[PDB]
Design an enzyme around this catalytic site. Structure first.
Site, PDB file in Angstrom:
ATOM      1  N   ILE A  23     -22.106  47.597 -10.030  1.00 39.54           N
ATOM      2  CA  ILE A  23     -23.046  46.717 -10.749  1.00 39.54           C
ATOM      3  C   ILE A  23     -23.586  47.456 -11.957  1.00 39.54           C
ATOM      4  O   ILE A  23     -24.202  48.524 -11.798  1.00 39.54           O
ATOM      5  CB  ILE A  23     -24.286  46.287  -9.876  1.00 39.54           C
ATOM      6  CG1 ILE A  23     -23.867  45.539  -8.594  1.00 39.54           C
ATOM      7  CG2 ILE A  23     -25.218  45.380 -10.723  1.00 39.54           C
ATOM      8  CD1 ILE A  23     -24.956  45.523  -7.543  1.00 39.54           C
ATOM      9  N   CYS A  24     -23.390  46.930 -13.163  1.00 39.63           N
ATOM     10  CA  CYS A  24     -23.971  47.522 -14.344  1.00 39.63           C
ATOM     11  C   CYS A  24     -25.301  46.853 -14.557  1.00 39.63           C
ATOM     12  O   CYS A  24     -25.360  45.684 -14.949  1.00 39.63           O
ATOM     13  CB  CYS A  24     -23.068  47.235 -15.531  1.00 39.63           C
ATOM     14  SG  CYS A  24     -23.663  47.964 -17.061  1.00 39.63           S
ATOM     15  N   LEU A  25     -26.363  47.599 -14.268  1.00 36.84           N
ATOM     16  CA  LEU A  25     -27.750  47.098 -14.319  1.00 36.84           C
ATOM     17  C   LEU A  25     -28.638  48.277 -14.646  1.00 36.84           C
ATOM     18  O   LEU A  25     -28.646  49.277 -13.895  1.00 36.84           O
ATOM     19  CB  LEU A  25     -28.100  46.486 -12.947  1.00 36.84           C
ATOM     20  CG  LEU A  25     -29.463  45.832 -12.852  1.00 36.84           C
ATOM     21  CD1 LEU A  25     -29.623  44.691 -13.842  1.00 36.84           C
ATOM     22  CD2 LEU A  25     -29.717  45.341 -11.424  1.00 36.84           C
ATOM     23  N   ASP A  57     -23.204  44.953 -21.787  1.00 40.34           N
ATOM     24  CA  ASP A  57     -22.633  45.801 -20.750  1.00 40.34           C
ATOM     25  C   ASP A  57     -21.394  45.164 -20.146  1.00 40.34           C
ATOM     26  O   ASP A  57     -21.461  44.647 -19.031  1.00 40.34           O
ATOM     27  CB  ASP A  57     -23.655  45.971 -19.620  1.00 40.34           C
ATOM     28  CG  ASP A  57     -24.970  46.576 -20.086  1.00 40.34           C
ATOM     29  OD1 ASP A  57     -24.948  47.538 -20.881  1.00 40.34           O
ATOM     30  OD2 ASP A  57     -26.030  46.092 -19.621  1.00 40.34           O
ATOM     31  N   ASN A 114     -20.658  41.813 -15.430  1.00 37.53           N
ATOM     32  CA  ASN A 114     -21.355  43.096 -15.193  1.00 37.53           C
ATOM     33  C   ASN A 114     -21.087  43.662 -13.800  1.00 37.53           C
ATOM     34  O   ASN A 114     -21.743  44.613 -13.361  1.00 37.53           O
ATOM     35  CB  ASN A 114     -22.879  42.964 -15.423  1.00 37.53           C
ATOM     36  CG  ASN A 114     -23.225  42.300 -16.736  1.00 37.53           C
ATOM     37  OD1 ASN A 114     -23.813  41.251 -16.747  1.00 37.53           O
ATOM     38  ND2 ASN A 114     -22.848  42.913 -17.854  1.00 37.53           N
TER      39      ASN A 114
END
Length: 149
Positions: free
Chosen positions: A86-88, A119, A79
């Site tokens: 950052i995929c969050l 993700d 992620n």
């Protein structure tokens, strides 16, 4: 505006009064809207022993829009990409003014501990995470050695 500044100062103080003890964050120099952070690799994760640096930029309407947070240290993770993006969820569609930098860092720590399957910012790392965990861990440990020590 002044409301954002007040809130950023309060969070800085919150971090000092109740230090997380594996993370840290605060202004780079004198610019309250640009912070640095550090997260220690969690124990019992392939990141153990590593120290990972981040940058944080607060918008002028914080806390009603999320801060922009990226890694500066390279990391092998589904992620987080090679740009440190950052995929969050909570940094995008799931931000709330009840969230704080402290909570963001804890969420990122948890993300390091347990990646999100839906993700894949780095599709191949996501694939190895799902198909060969022991291989994922070996490589994530090697990258911790190479970049985060």
């Amino acid at each position: 505006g002044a409301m954002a500044l007040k809130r950023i100062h309060k969070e800085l103080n919150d971090l000092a009064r109740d230090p997380p003890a594996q993370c840290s964050a605060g202004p780079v120099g004198d610019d309250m809207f640009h912070w640095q952070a550090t997260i220690m690799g969690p124990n019992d994760s392939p990141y153990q022993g590593g120290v990972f640096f981040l940058t944080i930029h607060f918008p002028t309407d914080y806390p009603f829009k999320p801060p922009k947070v990226a890694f500066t240290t390279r990391i092998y993770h589904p992620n987080i990409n090679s740009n440190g993006s950052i995929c969050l969820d909570i940094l995008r569609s799931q931000w709330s003014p009840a969230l704080t930098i402290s909570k963001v860092l804890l969420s990122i720590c948890s993300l390091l501990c347990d990646p999100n399957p839906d993700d894949p910012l780095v599709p191949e790392i996501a694939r190895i995470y799902k198909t060969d965990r022991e291989k994922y861990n070996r490589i994530a440990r090697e990258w911790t050695q190479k970049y985060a020590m």
